[PDB]
């Protein structure tokens, strides 16, 4: 799908991301533009061999099953193709766990450097929320 500046993000809040498990949900919306650029079908492989999926940009190596990830924990226990559709309603369970390791955003590559210390309230701001 193609989601605009004010239309793909009001749904983080419909899923409990608001201020959940210590990260403020204000801090969240910026990074999305940095991982798949508001696209729920944009995916790529990893130069280390495990492909990634979604706006989420996650690989089947440590987290889900795509069948090409051996030595994969499949900690998500769901097909990786189970998130890339227009609908995204159940795709957050695993996202809701990825911060539980205590690693935080240790997984999101763009945020720690593109959205870490940025004017992020300048990212979620302006839409009605």
Ligand X SMILES: CC(=O)N[C@@H]1[C@@H](O)[C@H](O[C@@H]2O[C@H](CO)[C@@H](O[C@@H]3O[C@H](CO)[C@@H](O[C@@H]4O[C@H](CO)[C@@H](O)[C@H](O)[C@H]4NC(C)=O)[C@H](O)[C@H]3NC(C)=O)[C@H](O)[C@H]2NC(C)=O)[C@@H](CO)O[C@H]1O
Among 11-19, 22-30, 52-60, 119-127, the segment contacting ligand X (CB under 6 A): 52-60
Per-residue b or e along 66-102, where b marks 16 or more CB atoms closer than 10 Å to that residue's CB: beebeebebebeeebeebbeeebeebbebbeebbeee
Q: Which residues contact 86 (CB under 8 A, 6 or more apart)?
A: 1, 40
Residue 44 CB, nearest distance to ligand X (Å)?
4
Residue 106 CB, nearest distance to ligand X (Å)?
5
User: By the 8 A CB rule, do 83 and 53 touch?
Assistant: yes
Active site residue 18: no
Of the listed 7, 18, 48, 52, which one is catalytic?
A: 52
101 is known to lie in a ligand binding site: yes
Q: Which residues are annotated as a binding site for substrate?
A: 101
Interface contacts to ligand X, rule CB under 6 A: 44, 46, 52, 57-59, 62, 101, 103, 106-109
């Amino acid at each position: 799908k193609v989601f605009g500046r004010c239309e793909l993000a009001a749904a983080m809040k419909r899923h409990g991301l608001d201020n959940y498990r210590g990260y403020s949900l204000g801090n969240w919306v910026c990074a999305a533009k940095f991982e798949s650029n508001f696209n729920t079908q944009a995916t790529n492989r990893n130069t280390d061999g495990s492909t990634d999926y979604g706006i989420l940009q996650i690989n089947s190596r440590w987290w889900c099953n795509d069948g090409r990830t051996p030595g994969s924990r499949n900690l998500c226990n769901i097909p990786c193709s189970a998130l890339l559709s227009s609908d995204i309603t159940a795709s957050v369970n695993c996202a809701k766990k990825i911060v539980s390791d205590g690693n935080g955003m240790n997984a999101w590559v763009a945020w720690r450097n593109r959205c870490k210390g940025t004017d992020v309230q300048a990212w979620i701001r302006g839409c009605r929320l």
